[PDB]
Amino acid sequence: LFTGVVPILVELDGDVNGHKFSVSGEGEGDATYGKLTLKFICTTGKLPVPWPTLVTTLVQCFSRYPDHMKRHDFFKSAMPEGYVQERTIFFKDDGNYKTRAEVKFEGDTLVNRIELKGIDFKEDGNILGHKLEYNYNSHNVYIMADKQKNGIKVNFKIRHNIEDGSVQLADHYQQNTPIGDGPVLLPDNHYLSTQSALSKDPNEKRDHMVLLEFVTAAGI
Amino acid sequence: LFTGVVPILVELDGDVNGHKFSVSGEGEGDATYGKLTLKFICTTGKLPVPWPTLVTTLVQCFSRYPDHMKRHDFFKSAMPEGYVQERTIFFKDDGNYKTRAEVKFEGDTLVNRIELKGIDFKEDGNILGHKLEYNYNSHNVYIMADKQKNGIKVNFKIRHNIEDGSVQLADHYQQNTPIGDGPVLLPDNHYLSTQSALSKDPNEKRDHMVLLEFVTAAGI
C-alpha cells in the first residue's frame, strides 16, 4: 500500500481568535524513504497565523520504519480506513490550538482533513505578532500505546525560532485512534525522528509554504 | 554569475586523531532561491566521524540576499576569484576541528577544497563514539566586517542532537578573506538564516550523506 509514492491532499479549515482561514495542500510522500513533499496554499488570502505554527497539524504514516520495527507501525496498520488524530497544542505563554483530523485513504490519495480552533492568543504574542522565523528544527516525536483505547499517545515539544534569536515552545499533546473496528498494531515505546525545511515557490503568487520533511522511526 | 543553477564540487581531505579520510561531493546550488543540493561520498570507505559534524565545513555564496541587501553580499562580491574560509570549531567537552578551505570558481563549477584537521577528541566522546543523530537544526549565522583584513568575521554555535535526547554544541569561529586583490563588499552586520535536512540515497552503496539546505540573509 505505502510501497511507492503516494499522492497526498491536505485540507484545513480553521479559526484562531475569530479569524477564519483555509489551507489546502498537495504533495506526495514516500514511506520507503520517509520523504514528504508538500505545497500548501492559504486559499482565503493571507494566513492570520505564521506558516510554521501549522507544520505539525498539516501524516505520520509516511515515516520510514526500518524492517525490524514493522510491528510498531500503528500509523500504516490503521490503513487504509485510517485513524483520527487529535491534539492539544499549548504555545508557551500564549494561546493553544485544538485540532481534530481524519486521515484515511480516498482512492489512491492519502487525505488529511483537519479542523483547527485556537484561542487565547495575544496580539502582542509571537504567534499573532508574527515574530517567528521561517524555518524549522528537528525533533523527536515520542510514541506509546494507549492499550485501552486501541491506539497511541504521542507527545513532544516543538521549538520555533523567534526572529530575535529567542525560542517559542509549542507543547503537543497527541492522540491517535483507528477509524475501523479491525485489529491494529499497538507499538512498543519508540520515537519518530523528524527533520523539516520550509521554503517558497518563485512561481507561486498565492500565500503559501513549501515543506520538505524526512521522518524515520527509532528507539528499538 | 550566480543568476542560475551553478554546479558545485566539494573536496575535503582530513585527519581526526590520526584517522585519515576523504570526502568528495557533488550537487548544485541556486542563489536566487538559496537552495543547495549536495551528495557527499566518503571516498576512502567509512567516515571515522559522523556525517553531521562536517555539515558546516562541507559554500555560503549560495545564500539568497533579498535585493535591498545586495551591498552586504561579501561572498558573491569576492567571485569569481574566490575567498579563503578558515574556521576553528570547538565541540563542547571534546576535540576541535581546524579547517581551511578555498572557494573559487573553476570554469563553471564552484569549487570548495578543504583541508581538515581535528584533535583532542575522546573515544568516549559523542563525536568518535558516534552518539549523534542523523539530523540538523536551523541556526543563525552572524556576520560582521573585518575592516582591516578586508573580509568578514562569522560566528555561531551549532546544535547537534545526540541520540539520547541531549544536545552537542559546536562553537564556530569563522574568518573569510578574498583571494583577489580587487575591492570587495564589506557588509553591515546581518545574519544568514540556514535550514538543513540530511538524508540517504537508496541507490547509493558507498558511505555518504545527502544534504539539502536553504539559506537566506536577514537582519537589515
Side-chain angles (χ1 to χ4, degrees), chain A residues 1-10 12-45 47-114 116-148 150-202 204-220, chain B residues 1-10 12-45 47-114 116-148 150-202 204-220:
Chain A
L1 187 62
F2 289 87
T3 25
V5 178
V6 168
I8 310 183
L9 202 329
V10 174
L12 187 154
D13 286 329
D15 173 281
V16 187
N17 287 21
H19 305 43
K20 277 121 60 193
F21 62 82
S22 288
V23 179
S24 152
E26 343 85 47
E28 41 174 54
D30 186 13
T32 315
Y33 304 120
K35 193 190 188 184
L36 266 168
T37 276
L38 277 306
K39 180 178 170 183
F40 303 101
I41 305 295
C42 176
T43 64
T44 69
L47 204 72
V49 289
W51 275 121
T53 74
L54 297 175
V55 174
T56 51
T57 294
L58 301 156
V59 103
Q60 289 157 323
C61 41
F62 283 97
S63 341
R64 161 171 77 94
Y65 267 79
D67 290 283
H68 71 257
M69 271 176 95
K70 288 178 175 297
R71 61 182 174 94
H72 303 275
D73 202 351
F74 167 70
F75 300 115
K76 301 181 201 69
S77 77
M79 294 310 173
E81 313 175 65
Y83 50 77
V84 184
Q85 179 172 295
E86 286 182 289
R87 290 205 173 101
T88 311
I89 309 176
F90 302 94
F91 287 95
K92 192 189 191 175
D93 305 314
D94 207 355
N96 64 47
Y97 285 166
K98 292 176 59 209
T99 74
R100 186 197 196 265
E102 215 160 81
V103 17
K104 53 193 204 298
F105 251 112
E106 296 183 34
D108 62 334
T109 304
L110 187 288
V111 172
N112 173 11
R113 317 162 174 285
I114 314 136
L116 171 149
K117 169 191 167 192
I119 64 185
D120 285 45
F121 293 84
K122 297 164 195 152
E123 46 286 327
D124 60 279
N126 296 289
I127 281 74
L128 288 190
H130 288 245
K131 299 185 169 193
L132 273 61
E133 264 169 306
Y134 193 77
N135 63 30
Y136 225 87
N137 297 294
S138 277
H139 306 93
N140 286 143
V141 166
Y142 294 96
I143 307 173
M144 306 167 89
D146 189 309
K147 227 65 178 189
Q148 300 315 297
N150 211 58
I152 66 182
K153 269 188 178 192
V154 196
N155 148 79
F156 58 102
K157 269 163 197 65
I158 289 285
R159 303 179 78 255
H160 304 296
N161 289 178
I162 308 311
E163 82 183 298
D164 76 274
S166 54
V167 157
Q168 176 78 104
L169 294 180
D171 250 312
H172 280 73
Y173 289 96
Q174 182 179 348
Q175 181 183 281
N176 292 96
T177 75
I179 295 216
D181 314 276
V184 101
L185 293 178
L186 267 53
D188 268 7
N189 284 15
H190 66 303
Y191 67 97
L192 294 178
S193 182
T194 79
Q195 294 177 77
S196 322
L198 315 183
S199 72
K200 261 66 168 69
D201 180 352
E204 179 57 71
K205 333 287 268 63
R206 296 171 295 182
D207 191 359
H208 68 321
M209 145 165 83
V210 172
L211 168 66
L212 179 86
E213 219 160 67
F214 297 103
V215 202
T216 56
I220 281 176
Chain B
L1 187 62
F2 289 87
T3 25
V5 178
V6 168
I8 310 183
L9 202 329
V10 174
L12 187 154
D13 286 329
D15 173 281
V16 187
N17 287 21
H19 305 43
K20 277 121 60 193
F21 62 82
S22 288
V23 179
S24 152
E26 343 85 47
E28 41 174 54
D30 186 13
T32 315
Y33 304 120
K35 193 190 188 184
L36 266 168
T37 276
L38 277 306
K39 180 178 170 183
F40 303 101
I41 305 295
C42 176
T43 64
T44 69
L47 204 72
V49 289
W51 275 121
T53 74
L54 297 175
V55 174
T56 51
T57 294
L58 301 156
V59 103
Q60 289 157 323
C61 41
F62 283 97
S63 341
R64 161 171 77 94
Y65 267 79
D67 290 283
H68 71 257
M69 271 176 95
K70 288 178 175 297
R71 61 182 174 94
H72 303 275
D73 202 351
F74 167 70
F75 300 115
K76 301 181 201 69
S77 77
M79 294 310 173
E81 313 175 65
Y83 50 77
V84 184
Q85 179 172 295
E86 286 182 289
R87 290 205 173 101
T88 311
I89 309 176
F90 302 94
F91 287 95
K92 192 189 191 175
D93 305 314
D94 207 355
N96 64 47
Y97 285 166
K98 292 176 59 209
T99 74
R100 186 197 196 265
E102 215 160 81
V103 17
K104 53 193 204 298
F105 251 112
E106 296 183 34
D108 62 334
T109 304
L110 187 288
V111 172
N112 173 11
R113 317 162 174 285
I114 314 136
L116 171 149
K117 169 191 167 192
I119 64 185
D120 285 45
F121 293 84
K122 297 164 195 152
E123 46 286 327
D124 60 279
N126 296 289
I127 281 74
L128 288 190
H130 288 245
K131 299 185 169 193
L132 273 61
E133 264 169 306
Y134 193 77
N135 63 30
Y136 225 87
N137 297 294
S138 277
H139 306 93
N140 286 143
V141 166
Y142 294 96
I143 307 173
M144 306 167 89
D146 189 309
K147 227 65 178 189
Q148 300 315 297
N150 211 58
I152 66 182
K153 269 188 178 192
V154 196
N155 148 79
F156 58 102
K157 269 163 197 65
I158 289 285
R159 303 179 78 255
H160 304 296
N161 289 178
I162 308 311
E163 82 183 298
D164 76 274
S166 54
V167 157
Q168 176 78 104
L169 294 180
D171 250 312
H172 280 73
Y173 289 96
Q174 182 179 348
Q175 181 183 281
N176 292 96
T177 75
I179 295 216
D181 314 276
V184 101
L185 293 178
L186 267 53
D188 268 7
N189 284 15
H190 66 303
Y191 67 97
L192 294 178
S193 182
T194 79
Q195 294 177 77
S196 322
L198 315 183
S199 72
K200 261 66 168 69
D201 180 352
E204 179 57 71
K205 333 287 268 63
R206 296 171 295 182
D207 191 359
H208 68 321
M209 145 165 83
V210 172
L211 168 66
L212 179 86
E213 219 160 67
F214 297 103
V215 202
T216 56
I220 281 176

